[PDB]
Structure 1
Amino acid sequence: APVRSLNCTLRDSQQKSLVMSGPYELKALHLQGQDMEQQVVFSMSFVQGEESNDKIPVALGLKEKNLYLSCVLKDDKPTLQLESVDPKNYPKKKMEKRFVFNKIEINNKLEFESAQFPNWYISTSQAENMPVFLGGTKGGQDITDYTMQFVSS
C-alpha cells in the first residue's frame, strides 16, 4: 500500500496502558482484564525520512480516527499533542516533520524520539492516570521505553 501501516498497542516499561483522556489527550494507567479494551489502538505508519537498521521513522495515528500525535512548540517548549487532519489526505508517505517520530529499538523495548526535536521522547509518568507527554531527558524519573503488541486489524 502507498503508505504501509500496522495496528498496535503500546505499554510503557512499567506495564501501564494508554487510553484517551479528553478528545486531544492520552493518559497512561495500570489497566487489566475488562478495562483492557479501553486502551488506544494505534495505526503506525512507516513514512519517509532518515532511516537506520535500528532507527525507523514512523507516524502514530489513532486507528480509524483522523487524529495523529504531533510535536509542536507551545510556550517555547517542545510539546506533544493530538492533532486533527483532513481524513482524505492522510495518512501519506511524506508526513510533515511534526508528525514524525524515530522508532528506536534498544533492549527489546522501543523508544520514540521526536524527529522535529532531537532527544525529546514520548514519555509517561511513574504516577497513575497522568498525561502522556514529550520529555527531554532519558534515564530518569520519567519512563521513555515501551513494548509493542500487534493487533489483528
Structure 2
Amino acid sequence: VRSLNCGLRDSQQKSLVMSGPYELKALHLQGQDMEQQVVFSMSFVQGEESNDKIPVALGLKEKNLYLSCVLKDDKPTLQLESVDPKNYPKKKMEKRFVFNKIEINKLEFESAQFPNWYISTSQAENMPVFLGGTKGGQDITDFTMQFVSS
C-alpha cells in the first residue's frame, strides 16, 4: 500500500495541529504561531476510484492513530482511533477510516462511512477539526496538501 506524508491546511490558511492526544485543531501559522502542522500519512486504499475521487486513509505519522468516523450522540463524529502498527496501514481498510479525497484546485475529504459528511474547521482560530454536514455556511471543507519534508 502506497503512502505519502503531508500536512493539511484549509482554504482560509488554517493549518491542522494537535490539540491534546486525541484531538486536532486549526489555526493560522506562518506569522502568528510557527510552522508545525501535524504530519499525516495518507494511504491509497480501496473503494470507488471515481473521476476525481480517490479513497484514502489519514494516519498520524508515528502515533499509530487514524482518523475515523463513528456515530456518537447520534451524529457522525471524527475520533482518532488506535491501531496496531503490525496491521496498519497495510490493507484495504475498514469503512470508518476511509475518506473519498475529492479534487477540485482544493481537496475535500468525505466520510465513505457517512456520505455527505466532511472533515471541517471553523472560521475561528484554535477550534477542533470535526465532521460537518453542510459544505456551505461558515465552516470550511476545502484544503491543500502541504509539504513538510526532510
Q: CA deviation at 1:11?
A: 0.5
The gaps in structure 2 that reach 5 residues or longer are: none
The structural deviation recorded for 1:141 is 1.0
Percent identical residues: 99
Q: TM-score, normalised by structure 1?
A: 0.93
Partner residue in 1 for 2:111 = 114
Moved over 4 A (4+): none
The unaligned stretches of length 5 or more in structure 1 are none
The CA deviation at 1:35 is 4.2
Alignment partner of 1:139 out of 128, 136, 143: 136
- TM-superposed CA distance for 1:25, in Å, is 0.1
CA distance in 2, matches of 1:102, 1:11: 17
Query: For residues 76 and 121 of structure 2, what CA distance do their matches in structure 1 show?
Result: 15
CA distance in 2 between partners of 1:93 and 1:130 (Å): 32
Q: Once superposed, what is the RMSD of the aligned Cα atoms?
A: 1.4
- Worse-matched range after superposition: 87-96 or 118-127: 87-96
- Give the CA deviation at 1:118: 0.3
Please state how far the C-alpha of 1:93 moved relative to its aligned partner.
Answer: 2.9
Residues 46, 57 of structure 1: 8 Å contact kept? yes
Question: Is the 8 Å Cα contact of residues 12 and 147 (structure 1) preserved in structure 2?
Answer: yes
Distance, in Å, in 2 between the alignment partners of 1:142 and 1:16 is 12
Normalization by structure 2: what TM-score? 0.95
Please state how far the C-alpha of 1:140 moved relative to its aligned partner: 1.4
- SS for the counterpart of 2:9 is strand
8 Å CA contact 1:46–1:93 kept in 2: the answer is: no
Contact 1:69-1:82 within 8 A present in 2 as well: yes
Which of residues 27, 42, 45 in structure 2 aligns to 1:44?
Answer: 42
Any idea what the Cα deviations from partners look like across 1:7-49, whole Å, max 9, x if unmatched? 0011000000111001110000111259434310110000011
CA deviation after TM superposition for structure 1 residue 52, in Å? 1.4
Whichever structure has more strand as a proportion of its residues is: 2
The answer to whether the Cα contact below 8 Å between 2:29 and 2:35 also exists between their aligned partners in 1 is: no
